[PDB]
Amino acid sequence: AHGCRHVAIIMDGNGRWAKKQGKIRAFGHKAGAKSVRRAVSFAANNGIEALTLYAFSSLMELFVWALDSEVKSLHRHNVRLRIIGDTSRFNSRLQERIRKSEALTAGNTGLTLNIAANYGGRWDIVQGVRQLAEKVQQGNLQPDQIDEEMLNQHVCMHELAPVDLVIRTGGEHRISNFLLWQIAYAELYFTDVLWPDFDEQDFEGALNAFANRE
Amino acid sequence: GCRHVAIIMDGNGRWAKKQGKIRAFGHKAGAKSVRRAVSFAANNGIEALTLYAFSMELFVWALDSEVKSLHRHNVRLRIIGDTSRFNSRLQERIRKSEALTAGNTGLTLNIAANYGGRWDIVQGVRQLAEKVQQGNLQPDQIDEEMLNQHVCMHELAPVDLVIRTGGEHRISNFLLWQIAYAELYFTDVLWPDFDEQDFEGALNAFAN
Numbered sequence: 001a002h003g004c005r006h007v008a009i010i011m012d013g014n015g016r017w018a019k020k021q022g023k024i025r026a027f028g029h030k031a032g033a034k035s036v037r038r039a040v041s042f043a044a045n046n047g048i049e050a051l052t053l054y055a056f057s058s059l060m061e062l063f064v065w066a067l068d069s070e071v072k073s074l075h076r077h078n079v080r081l082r083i084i085g086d087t088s089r090f091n092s093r094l095q096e097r098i099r100k101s102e103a104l105t106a107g108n109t110g111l112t113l114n115i116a117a118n119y120g121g122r123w124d125i126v127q128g129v130r131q132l133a134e135k136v137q138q139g140n141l142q143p144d145q146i147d148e149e150m151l152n153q154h155v156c157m158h159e160l161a162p163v164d165l166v167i168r169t170g171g172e173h174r175i176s177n178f179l180l181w182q183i184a185y186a187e188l189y190f191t192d193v194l195w196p197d198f199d200e201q202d203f204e205g206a207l208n209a210f211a212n213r214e
Numbered sequence: 215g216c217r218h219v220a221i222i223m224d225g226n227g228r229w230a231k232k233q234g235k236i237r238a239f240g241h242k243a244g245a246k247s248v249r250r251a252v253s254f255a256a257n258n259g260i261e262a263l264t265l266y267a268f269s270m271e272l273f274v275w276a277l278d279s280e281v282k283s284l285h286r287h288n289v290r291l292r293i294i295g296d297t298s299r300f301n302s303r304l305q306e307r308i309r310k311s312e313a314l315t316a317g318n319t320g321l322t323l324n325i326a327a328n329y330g331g332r333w334d335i336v337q338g339v340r341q342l343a344e345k346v347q348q349g350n351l352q353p354d355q356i357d358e359e360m361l362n363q364h365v366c367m368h369e370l371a372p373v374d375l376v377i378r379t380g381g382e383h384r385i386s387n388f389l390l391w392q393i394a395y396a397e398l399y400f401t402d403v404l405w406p407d408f409d410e411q412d413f414e415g416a417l418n419a420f421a422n
């Protein structure tokens with residue numbers, strides 16, 4: 001009914017939330033983690049095909065390690081987990097844990113959850129361009145055959161539904177080098193709600209704003 | 215301060231309809247609002263203003279008669295977008311207007327005509343792809359900096375602020391690469407009604 005197949009979220013405000021309560025930044029990150037679990041469960045229960053999350057605050061590897069402790073519980077919720085981002089310089093043990101987590105849940109049929117780790121929209125475009133340039137160098141591809149559809153096939157998430165809605169919590173009104181190519185046609189929803197307070201009703205509100213606007 | 219503002223100029227058609235007038239009248243009021251936004255940016259020290267007509271060859275034509283005045287105001291005019299299939303006479307006029315004002319050092323006005331943000335990236339990728347094919351470039355040498363050099367506006371200040379009139383909350387395949395770190399300001403005001411006060415309102419959001 002809400003019309004949304006793929007929702008992307010810039011999760012900002014963890015720092016400000018902890019500051020408001022006299023607490024250090026790490027309590028904000030723990031409340032922020034509870035808010036991810038809540039959003040993930042909401043998305044899965046509301047028929048969304050894909051949820052893409054970008055951890056930002058107005059130690060990437062620490063975030064991803066943290067996530068390794070959630071993977072068993074995601075799998076038990078029938079979530080297919082993927083990491084998007086430049087993980088090539090990450091630790092070898094971490095990179096192995098990523099591969100395995102992805103292998104483990106690739107057969108799940110419920111929500112597809114994409115976690116940005118060391119992700120940038122410009123980087124994502126550049127990596128697609130490098131894959132195309134290799135194919136030209138091999139003699140497989142003509143410069144002239146390159147069009148939007150082709151580059152589209154080489155950026156992250158090209159095999160998922162297009163992103164219909166981007167939500168950014170925390171009160172800033174920019175993209176901050178999250179998805180660029182993929183958000184050419186997306187609805188953009190900005191809320192002053194800080195990430196740890198963003199709850200089901202807030203998520204419902206963004207979906208119903210997309211349904212009324214589309 | 216804000217050095218480069220981009221505007222998606224939506225609401226001319228809806229404005230016509232609200233005024234109980236045919237579409238043509240909304241275009242004519244939209245053109246007046248163009249002149250007022252260009253003056254306002256020239257007067258307020260904005261370095262670059264990038265205008266996306268949205269809701270083409272005909273739009274470029276209407277600008278043709280403004281060039282003399284722009285040049286007199288030290289305005290550098292550029293058309294961005296795929297004009298390669300516009301009739302050759304119009305292409306020739308674009309080329310002449312650009313060359314006339316190319317040495318100007320005041321406000322740079324970019325008018326996006328048959329422009330798409332994905333297109334813009336792709337024509338940059340195609341250039342790089344030619345370089346690879348001629349052995350002038352290794353695939354692993356391609357980085358953000360280098361792609362940036364091949365997309366529109368790489369010689370101007372980075373886009374600081376994008377304004378969309380008309381009530382929609384989308385980029386609609388206007389700038390993509392260039393807006394990675396820009397402030398996005400959406401307003402329900404229709405483009406023909408957007409005036410100096412509205413533009414200052416957006417500049418304040420940036421200042422905060």
Ligand SMILES: CCCCCCCCOc1cccc(COc2ccc(Br)cc2P(=O)(O)O)c1
Nearest residue numbers: 029030033036037040041066067070073074077
């Ligand atoms: C200080 C650093 C903060 C730690 C960051 C933790 C990362 C966010 O926690 C999550 C991250 C990604 C996905 C999830 C999803 O968690 C769940 C999803 C569905 C279900 Br059922 C259960 C969980 P969980 O084991 O109850 O939290 C949580």
